Symmetry: C2
Subunit: 213 residues, 2 copies
């Protein structure tokens, strides 16, 4: 068979958007996925959690190329054959815009300090963007085949992106007994995101369907 010809394709939905990939298989152990994840969703819910409401906007525009390594690639066992480690890289462009609306008189926590929203309530808005011409990726996947023609998968990994760009702002007044004012607590949180090790990785979870011709 010709190495340059893909063996199949997949459709996927996950935390970095939806889309899919073309798939090549060099041998039972080593394969390649070239994909796009994009789109943009707006989850504006209304279910109150403890007096707060959250609104999430997300815009994605990612292109990725992964090697997939299957340690049990030649197995006829469907669970074993489906297990893989993904290593590769991607062009990343991801914007998150999260807004927390705190009801009047309700408590909420910012930078490990408790606050209580005043009579007019409190709004906290966060904008956070991951943009990388090329970011390395490592992940692990489980892609059991249902038969020779199709299957389903899940994949979890992370891109090493460095800290994202971040802008956090609050509106409204709050009472507190902690060390920081609301404004400082908010800026403290912006600073953690811009600087802590934890935020130098963009975690990824996706699920989807594989098709094989």
């Amino acid at each position: 068979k010709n190495q340059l010809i893909p063996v199949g394709a997949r459709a996927e939905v996950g935390t970095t958007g939806y889309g899919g990939a073309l798939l090549w298989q060099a041998n039972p152990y080593v394969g390649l996925a070239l994909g796009y994840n994009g789109g943009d969703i707006s989850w504006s819910d209304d279910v109150k959690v403890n007096g707060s409401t959250y609104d999430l906007d997300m815009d994605n525009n990612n292109v990725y190329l992964n090697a997939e390594i299957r340690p049990w690639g030649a197995s006829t066992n469907r669970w074993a054959q489906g297990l893989y480690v993904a290593a590769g890289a991607a062009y990343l462009d991801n914007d998150y815009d999260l807004t927390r609306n705190v009801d009047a008189t309700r408590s909420f926590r910012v930078n490990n300090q408790d606050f209580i929203a005043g009579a007019d309530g409190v709004k906290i808005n966060g904008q956070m963007s991951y943009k990388n011409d090329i970011a390395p990726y490592l992940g692990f996947g489980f892609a059991p085949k249902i038969n020779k023609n199709w299957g389903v998968f899940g994949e979890v990994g992370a891109y090493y992106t460095g800290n994202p760009t971040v802008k956090l702002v609050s509106s409204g007044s709050a009472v507190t007994t902690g060390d920081q004012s609301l404004e400082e607590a908010v800026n403290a949180e912006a600073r953690k995101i811009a600087n802590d090790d934890k935020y130098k990785w963009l975690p990824v979870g996706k699920v989807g369907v594989n098709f094989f011709w």
Copy 2:
């Protein structure tokens, strides 16, 4: 066989204390339990939940007489034979003394209003006593036999006691933006317990071991 002679005894531990009962069986469907639940425990934990620590003292001194009705009493099936409805009455004497210790700067909620403890923290103490010369009881039990000589059980029910006596007091200062001061919120909660329908019943959960001679 002689009706006046008990068929067995049980040991039990539950929310109204520990102890046990003597058991009579009039026929496979109708039996009687005469028991004592007493003791007194002090659960002073240290595991912080959201900046609060709780300390619980409980003192019990209850005598009860229940009829137990087994709709499937003549069954050899152990699950079916073990199912019963309990109806009876008890002398009740139960004291609860619950103390919530709120760390400095942490939020906590009283009478559906959020508060944040000041620099010196906040203590909330509640004393609540159920005392009844005779209170009706209804409950449901599951007492599977392991063999003819022994078994295990659980029972859940409630005594109609009317509202308990209640004393709630706070110490320390707190900030808030709600309608009530801390003192009023605390007294509001005392009033609910002294007056709401919900508190006119003392719920009971117990587990134990049955012995048959």
